[PDB]
Design a protein around this ligand. Structure first.
Ligand SMILES: OC[C@H]1O[C@H](O)[C@H](O)[C@@H](O)[C@H]1O
Length: 467
């Protein structure tokens, strides 16, 4: 019988099932790396030195954490790619916020102008960004009010930058397909984006003052801090587990290490020390456009989990694998989650979840596979997702410990957002299981809390907390 299939699956998947000792060792490695990063920051400031630390340990310049009692109307601009969003937030106190948003697809906004093109000027791009916010101001009939007294605005600008202060961030290089300004006298690269945005607001008569540029993880922490309610411990860790994976945290010795803010954007997706690398991980990195970078994220985030399932399927099934498994990106993290859900605690014998796996594999890969093969595929999906949760837990545990919040405040609130956590109830519970492995009984003082819209609401909250 081809029960060597089960032996092969065990051989291939065992290295993805991280032992307690392996997770503790990785926690130690990550904590040591974080300390090296603080020392790097103290020496080098705005200059990243990858030989000293794989973690950029960026100064967010955020020091003012909201209480939930702040009140007023605050705006945000979320520019992380072609899907731009303006947000308006009524901060009502008691942790309550009412939001509105306006969306623009940059592919449809130049008319006769490709906004992503090297021939497009900074002014043309920022005119469109400012116009997104202006459309929201006009929806609220607020343009004249804002001429009398400007509203404050936070800006999530999700590109590599050099940030000297909360309201001063210079674009280091374009990513994500953008090349705006490269062939003009009016570049974005090498310029502080805040004066460019301010000039565009002025050209439209818009009374908005950008007081912060904020990373999405920091916005996630701030969204949670405002909305959680005082009846619990402080929010000192922010986590995104979605298409990408990153965290931020409140650093108690920030001043001694040369930080202006207290919140550090770790950029831990690039963590690269003593990773539990498997051949599938090497294959994902080797064909990626960012070889040797984001190696921790490549084991964790939704962009990669489907690819992991696909490559492991090919490794385990060989000539029995379906033809579509040979196609890059043919299987995504939502599909992998269907597989993993069927092997979560208490669900291993659930017929409906297993049936959903059979239906999925027929639809996505045209694979009319037998019972033994179906069980193996479920095990592959489970192994990939459970490793993502375990590694996320390592990062959370190390940051929780570094905040000292358990010692100083008796507990900690960890803000979490991102599709892996939001779409899969069991994912956070797996994270908590691994956190208990890492932290012991004091995990009962750690509270994972869903936090929404760090890139919009969170940036508006950032500027509201400055008052
Ligand atoms: O969006 C989540 C996450 O994605 C990547 O890791 C980016 O490098 C980070 O800035 C981060 O915040």
């Amino acid at each position: 019988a081809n029960n060597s299939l089960e032996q092969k699956a065990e051989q291939v998947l065992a290295p993805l099932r991280l032992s307690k000792e392996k997770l503790q060792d990785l926690s130690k490695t990550f904590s040591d790396e974080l300390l090296r990063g603080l020392e790097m920051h103290k020496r080098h400031g705005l200059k990243w030195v990858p030989e000293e630390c794989s973690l950029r340990m960026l100064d967010s310049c955020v020091s003012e954490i909201p209480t939930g009692n702040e009140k007023g109307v605050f705006y945000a601009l979320d520019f992380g790619g072609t899907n731009v969003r303006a947000v308006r937030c009524e901060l009502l106190g008691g942790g309550r916020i009412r939001s509105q948003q306006f969306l623009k697809n940059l592919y449809e906004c130049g008319g006769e102008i490709d906004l992503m093109a090297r021939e497009t000027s900074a002014s043309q791009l920022f005119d469109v960004l400012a116009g997104c916010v202006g459309e929201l101001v006009e929806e609220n009939n607020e343009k004249e009010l804002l001429k009398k007294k400007a509203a404050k605005l936070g800006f999530t600008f999700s590109f590599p930058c050099v940030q000297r202060s909360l309201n001063n961030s210079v674009l280091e290089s374009w990513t994500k397909g953008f090349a705006t300004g490269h062939d003009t006298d009016d570049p974005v690269v090498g310029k502080d984006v805040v004066p460019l945005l301010a000039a565009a607001f002025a050209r439209q008569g818009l009374g908005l003052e950008c007081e912060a540029v904020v990373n999405d993880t920091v916005g996630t922490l701030l969204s949670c801090a405002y909305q959680k309610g005082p009846g619990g411990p402080p929010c000192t860790v922010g986590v995104i587990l979605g298409t990408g994976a990153n965290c931020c945290y409140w650093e108690p010795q920030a001043a001694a290490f040369g930080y202006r803010g207290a919140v550090v954007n770790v950029e831990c997706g690039n963590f690269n020390k003593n990773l539990p690398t498997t051949p599938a991980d090497e294959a994902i990195d080797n064909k990626s456009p960012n070889k040797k970078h984001q190696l921790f994220e490549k084991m964790i985030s939704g962009f990669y989990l489907g690819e992991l399932v696909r490559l492991l399927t090919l490794e385990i099934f060989g000539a029995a694998a379906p033809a579509k498994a040979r196609e890059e990106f043919s299987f995504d993290a939502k599909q992998a989650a269907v597989l993993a859900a069927s092997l979560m605690p208490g669900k291993e014998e659930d017929p409906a979840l297993a049936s959903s796996c059979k239906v999925l594999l027929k639809e996505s890969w045209g694979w009319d596979l037998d019972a033994a093969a179906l069980k193996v595929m479920r095990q592959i999906g489970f192994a990939v997702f459970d490793r993502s949760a375990a590694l996320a837990a390592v990062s959370i545990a190390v940051l929780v410990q570094r905040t000292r919040s358990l010692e100083t405040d008796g507990g900690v609130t960890v803000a979490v957002d991102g599709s892996l956590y939001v779409r899969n109830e069991w994912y956070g519970l797996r994270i908590r299981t691994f956190l208990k492995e890492l932290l012991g009984e004091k995990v009962d003082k750690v509270f994972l809390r869903a936090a929404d819209d760090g890139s919009g609401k969170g940036a508006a909250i950032c500027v509201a907390a400055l008052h």
